[PDB]
């Protein structure tokens, strides 16, 4: 069969941060405000609560409250199912379906049996089964000590028709593996870019349908610009292919913070630099950038903004592909 | 100064499994029964709730109930502080001190900022600070994407005098590193063996004071025998050095299950093979050994038991060092 | 079901060398003589034509002639299907069944699509299908740029019930993987030792049913002695476990030539040192040990023989387990 | 001495595929037609039968028939000597000289003694000696488990003056090694690009004289364009250096299929997409791209063609350097 | 505090070669001439005697004579403290301060205790203490079997306020580590580029203040051009960012000789190609490029010069940023 | 030809430490006393000045004075040629021949061109040429960033007949490589054990003629005992093969200090523990074991001594093979 790809996995999709109130509990009003703003800027959906959202630091109830709030605001939500155990992940998925979220981000099993593929298969089945009506994407990362390859992916999809996507945070070779062996069938399966540094490669070299973004919370217009240029390049455009690469290269240092353990520290600090004070505090009192880290990101943020202010005036694909 | 090592980190110490009731909730009565039995067999203390105890699958309340039950039974308890976040780990530590546990097993930060050493330092400080009166051991493993080396260990101990030990699950070279650079000072610091395959190396080559054991839940007398022989070898005994190595080698396959992701599946199945039916079920309904895995452990369990039944009759150190 | 393991994959089984006539064509009369001798010495079967037999240097017709000759002599033969292409491998298998060989050694695809698992699956199916009545073992080695894991093995066996074994030339961890995940089911599947250095580990730690041997062509009685001791150790015998390891250790250097590219040069030279002049020449005129290599093997052969002459007089398991 | 480089190793040189007749035997008429077409398009020579030509799947007689047919058509032929054994490789070389091929591609020993450098030296000598009048290039690849370095190359060339080139399929560092240490002497030695992804690096950074191409069978004009631009860049041209890199980058995904095990599956499928139906079947009945692989290459082929149709209209070096 | 960076570690700074007289003793007159010339060309300082200067081949007295000569000529000198032992390194540092050199390049301990971090800490302290009034940069390289990380760097700087810089010869990830964690504080610390291939990355992505250059001895105007363009790119300039990368890419092969063991052979030969005959001989009579190496560098030197002659005429940032 | 191995490279040979006077200059009287003592204990020769002797910390004159003193005392001396440059190494070699040392230890080039094999070949030639009448051994270690393999070794020996040995400090596989490919010819070439942990493997598995020892300075009788047992095992003795391995295993921790950067700190401290106070100070004022390192070696030294005191009373090979 030839099947339409799931619309919820198309376009540019921020994985939202959870802002803190002054008492270091979640500020759900601020979460919804930012979600609405980002959709207004041109994002197609949001992911909540992912690693950008500090999921391990929040209770399941808090995450579910945030999901509810975002959905009730009319924002298309892909729910993150990251969890300490099967029962928790399944609860996230069941709640997503109950409240009318639009998609599911299936995160592998951690802490108990993480490297066991047999465990991962059962865990994915349990999560998919809990939200059968929601399109689902599996996250694949070497962080888990195992890879979901084509065999496992297609065995899951045979029993779980909601499994329609594959989100790669790993390197370009892993994204290439997915494009060649999983996501280029006729059957409605979507590759999603899952790390900020792989946008051009994903869209142009790998046939990606959409990008889940960290840095796009901070620089939405610039990240949408890059995604648009990269999609135009994927149509064969000559100018856009050149401009996309220039923009990705200039964004590379800021995007690279998404690859490391301090991504929430860096991206919340950049939110603060753009004037959003509610991103000042972290849930853990001692989590903070070092003095050098703060200086480095400030320098690099100023550099990118200065370069973009002039580059973004250029004629041709640069104008055509703005958000 | 020359300081006595902490007695709680001496001897042979099972990291207890949590048995399931038929509804897959914890059977605390059975947990206490086994803890009492193992102390009776010659174990010096127990660890609860560690990875052997399925900590990620239990609520914090359940773990704390188990700790309380064990302490109220008069069992010396080292509390596992494994957690999804700082607040949870600190709560485990605070509860340990409140109820009169005898020691603390400090597990590093996971899932959020795991590889960041700055994060680990603050996390360890928070945990140690929460139970200042309890001797504490830090667990060190490559699983965490970072190592606690001498610099960090001594900076922590300077501010947290309860930090008196260092539990290595990693390879023999990592245990050697600890012995050479951390645990061989005069100052009351203890190296603990933290994987079942490193007992002889730990006691004889590395000066270990005690062993935290997985397989010792199943084969307590045989593991105490190995530890005793290895301690006698550490005094310079010729016979015990030879016999310890023979026994470790024979135990090696069964002990090696402690190194992998399926350790709880293997060790609960061995408990069942020895007649303890309460170890039949797992908290997750689908977690089970495969047919081949079950056959392999059954074969190897029979082999070891047959060999030990005859070897354990030999004269000399083999008799002297029995539990 | 519980099924008997295939008898053809039990015991000690030399992978025969092909001796050269003076014109460097195969000496089939000598091949049959040695095969008969080795069975007489206590070997259970032979493998022909494997890498020990110089398969790439012989035509398919020559290999098939040798197989025919061995079978007509009443020797139980496991046929090697190593080949440059599918059609060749399938021809070897079909001939094996036609002439009444007793088993099949399934070697993976080489030179064309070697690392492609999809290719390997089809290739194995083609070979197994060509000799449905012959018990078959798949050879697994990192040399091929891929591993046959449990999933592939069981998918093949579901469609090809003749697939009943798994021959590992790789390291002890790979043999352990096979024992834990493939060969310890109740269903009649056999692990075969497939490198000379892994005999004790295979029988005792991995449940192996038999060994395919290179060095056993040269030292049949000594290799059968080691296999017998190792099998007795697998029953739980204390003495045999100690003696097996002593004998393996003494054999280790000579056995290690089986791991390298020059195995046929080393083992033919050892045949010559024992008085079998027909092993002097190689099919390629320039293939020869260097002066240092020749000196090294001569020294090590003398050393082992001297040690064994005295060690093999010891009482107990050493006498009980002789061929 | 200063010596002219061998003309046969200059320019752009497809390693031809062998098309199948409907019965999966070679279609030699079609082979010659394509060879003639590609020379007409601007290729300087062809390689037959290399890995692109499915050498392991064909008999020696079939390969030699194809070589004869190509030579009799007046096509300059470099003969591939890939073989299962020395006698076969030497036969290919002797036949090449007999029939008037123009060059020799010397492929290392496989399957027997592959990693032994002593074996490789003798094997190369045997092949070179069999066609003394034909200029010869040695193929160097990590696939063989050994590298031909300067010492071996110059020892061979001292005794075999026909050895005048060095074809690198390995990475850019290996090509750099060859340029720095082997091929930049005054003495008539040529570096040949031997993988489709290394064209610019080879010509500009490494002094290459020519390229043996896989993708150039499918996209001859575009590959000649890239080679021409890269050669102009090697003269110091500013525009060509920029344009060469743009074209290589756009060709990179299609070229990357040359690096993997499925190169013949991908490139025959692309031939089919361009209308050459005789490239439909493979010699092995079950060798075929998967559905995803087919979708991936189709998408990427369309993308490249669309981009090139517009990019190739640009003024300057892009026009000057067309085939 | 916010502190000005040390001016001596700004700009472009050649690590000078020591030319030989015909008797293979140092030609100090020629050393001073070249130092003066390079300052005249636009270099800000020189380093002497570093690895470019053949420090291990010269006596301490010879190095100190060269330093004296350069300082007396009015050239700003950063003194290299590379040494076989602590006493030697400290003597270099003490002499630097005595004669009025402007900075210190602190090279780690070698040959005795090289991998011991405790040894490195004491060694750095000894060197820094010997020249307290001179700004100092520590060289960091994997060549030493250890890395100076932030902890060690800041512990040294707390006791040695002259430690104000960090020179990275390692890869881009190591330079990134330094920028993120060491050199981006407000406190007057400078990252210096310490390998010729990392200029753009250092200035733009890592906030570098200056570059110590090998190839800049040979191509001073072109290296200053690259540094200027890269510094303009670090201000946010669009044109300069593009042009810097074009120039770095064209310089990449010549710059890459700085990464290898033969850097002095390559760069002295290039000096000879530009007409400086005093760079003909080496201190060791047999040290010389091979014929292929000489051909390779000659080809690549001609290529770069031809490309630059035309590229350097382009309007815009290329003109603005010339030396 | 069949040639006698060089007697100077036979037996057990300490690489002497250089004791310090209270002013941290060399105590040559003490050096000679210890050298004489060790010969009296049963050592066959000494090496001076090697890394054990702190060569990088001493002047060439000091080393040569020590060599002279040892030779004038009638001790057979193998001179270490470790050096910062060719001229220094050659001076050591020339002096060795002048004063009547009995052998040469050829150490590779460091600090300048270390990884360049062309450089190493010329450097070895220069050193060998400077002492043509002295038997010479080349040291081979991965520390140098290159390996001397058979090709280089035999090319050197063809022009330098004094090159008669090969000293391996690397792992067992590297020693095996040497035995198989270099040192097992008939031609008078000797493999020397060059790290304390490889004694049994060297003599029994690799045909070594002698051992250069670090720990043997401290425990001469025990190291000679191990060497004697290992040599008896190399004759085929059953008892000695078992006892050698027991003794090596017990010595393993103390021997392992020879593998690391702190070998001189550990072995001088052990000399002090045995009552030799002249081994208290190091040439560098701050070089000292840490508190933990000191505790570790003290514990392990006591353990070994206690075990040996009883083990060394056993009948059989243990008595026969004492010094």
XYZ file of C-alpha atoms in Angstrom, chain B residues 94-280:
187
model
C 17.169 10.956 55.208
C 14.872 8.026 55.881
C 17.826 5.688 56.360
C 19.176 7.930 59.094
C 15.714 8.424 60.648
C 14.969 4.715 61.041
C 18.455 3.616 62.127
C 19.947 1.934 59.174
C 23.660 1.306 59.621
C 25.065 2.515 56.290
C 24.419 4.265 53.026
C 25.163 3.104 49.413
C 25.467 6.398 47.386
C 24.468 5.783 43.758
C 25.307 8.473 41.114
C 22.844 10.722 39.297
C 21.075 9.198 36.289
C 18.892 10.303 33.339
C 19.457 14.047 33.832
C 23.067 15.351 33.589
C 24.527 11.895 34.162
C 27.865 12.439 32.523
C 28.428 15.844 34.069
C 30.981 15.592 36.858
C 29.872 18.907 38.318
C 26.353 17.469 38.657
C 27.699 14.276 40.282
C 29.683 16.193 42.856
C 26.655 18.214 43.979
C 24.447 15.143 43.967
C 26.833 13.139 46.163
C 27.109 16.108 48.544
C 23.336 16.341 48.822
C 22.975 12.639 49.619
C 25.856 12.495 52.135
C 24.559 15.648 53.871
C 21.133 14.002 54.355
C 22.508 11.140 56.449
C 25.608 12.558 58.190
C 25.638 9.913 60.916
C 25.673 6.936 58.557
C 28.865 5.532 57.087
C 28.630 5.808 53.318
C 30.066 4.038 50.312
C 29.972 5.496 46.735
C 29.244 3.179 43.949
C 31.542 3.547 40.929
C 30.622 2.011 37.525
C 31.246 2.793 33.834
C 27.450 2.344 33.390
C 27.168 6.047 34.584
C 29.371 7.578 31.893
C 31.831 8.878 34.485
C 34.216 7.682 37.161
C 34.690 8.944 40.704
C 38.448 9.279 40.934
C 40.659 10.111 43.864
C 40.367 13.885 43.496
C 36.561 13.922 43.692
C 36.500 11.246 46.373
C 38.841 13.151 48.669
C 37.150 16.494 48.047
C 33.859 14.896 49.087
C 35.386 13.216 52.143
C 36.955 16.496 53.329
C 33.447 17.979 53.647
C 31.569 14.742 54.393
C 33.395 12.627 56.931
C 30.805 9.902 56.622
C 32.145 9.056 53.199
C 34.320 6.068 54.112
C 34.113 3.656 51.234
C 34.279 2.976 47.615
C 32.315 0.104 45.915
C 33.619 -0.903 42.496
C 31.438 -2.905 40.065
C 33.851 -2.211 37.206
C 36.758 -4.354 36.050
C 39.881 -5.462 37.839
C 41.873 -2.477 36.568
C 39.318 -0.051 38.061
C 39.486 -1.905 41.436
C 43.234 -1.728 41.246
C 43.058 2.005 40.573
C 40.954 2.454 43.689
C 43.264 0.369 45.872
C 46.392 2.134 44.695
C 45.021 5.674 44.795
C 42.065 5.823 47.185
C 41.525 3.054 49.668
C 44.994 2.215 50.967
C 45.464 5.281 53.110
C 45.620 4.884 56.902
C 42.450 6.915 57.349
C 39.611 4.392 57.691
C 38.508 4.059 54.061
C 37.199 0.740 52.765
C 37.171 -0.800 49.286
C 34.123 -2.979 48.788
C 33.832 -5.616 46.077
C 30.791 -4.668 44.024
C 30.487 -7.363 41.399
C 30.326 -11.106 42.005
C 33.206 -11.979 39.687
C 35.853 -9.850 41.478
C 35.941 -11.415 44.953
C 39.446 -12.919 44.987
C 41.009 -9.975 43.167
C 39.303 -7.575 45.531
C 40.363 -9.183 48.795
C 43.845 -10.327 47.834
C 45.084 -7.915 45.208
C 43.139 -4.810 46.279
C 42.796 -4.928 50.123
C 38.967 -5.057 50.094
C 37.199 -5.152 53.464
C 33.960 -6.729 52.314
C 31.820 -7.823 49.358
C 28.334 -6.886 48.320
C 26.974 -10.020 46.635
C 24.239 -10.988 44.199
C 24.904 -14.715 43.858
C 25.356 -14.890 47.654
C 21.579 -14.570 48.051
C 21.316 -17.996 46.336
C 24.581 -19.653 47.490
C 25.352 -17.941 50.783
C 27.474 -20.667 52.334
C 29.552 -21.080 49.172
C 30.079 -17.337 48.735
C 31.050 -16.914 52.424
C 33.443 -19.857 51.916
C 35.058 -18.029 48.978
C 35.266 -14.764 50.905
C 36.791 -16.522 53.926
C 39.378 -18.314 51.804
C 40.195 -15.071 50.028
C 40.630 -13.219 53.322
C 42.909 -15.985 54.605
C 44.881 -15.677 51.342
C 45.151 -11.947 52.047
C 46.943 -12.879 55.292
C 49.539 -14.791 53.287
C 48.145 -18.309 53.547
C 49.449 -20.566 50.744
C 46.668 -23.184 50.769
C 43.830 -20.711 50.946
C 45.224 -18.735 47.984
C 45.070 -21.853 45.814
C 41.667 -22.992 47.085
C 40.082 -19.535 46.772
C 40.966 -19.398 43.108
C 39.601 -22.902 42.468
C 36.295 -21.956 44.091
C 36.054 -18.606 42.298
C 36.725 -20.288 38.977
C 34.006 -22.874 39.576
C 31.582 -20.103 40.598
C 32.531 -17.903 37.651
C 29.639 -18.630 35.257
C 26.962 -18.254 37.944
C 28.684 -15.127 39.238
C 28.892 -13.648 35.732
C 25.092 -13.233 35.585
C 25.677 -10.339 38.043
C 27.461 -8.435 35.277
C 24.572 -8.341 32.840
C 21.132 -6.743 32.486
C 19.253 -9.948 33.393
C 20.844 -10.412 36.867
C 17.481 -10.289 38.676
C 15.927 -12.790 36.184
C 18.833 -15.195 36.661
C 19.164 -14.907 40.423
C 15.390 -15.078 41.098
C 15.264 -18.214 38.905
C 18.110 -19.766 40.901
C 16.197 -18.966 44.132
C 13.265 -20.877 42.634
C 15.556 -23.815 41.728
C 16.594 -23.961 45.428
C 12.967 -24.145 46.489
C 12.048 -20.567 47.261
C 8.788 -20.226 45.214
C 8.240 -16.641 46.268
C 10.967 -15.687 43.779
C 8.885 -16.928 40.846
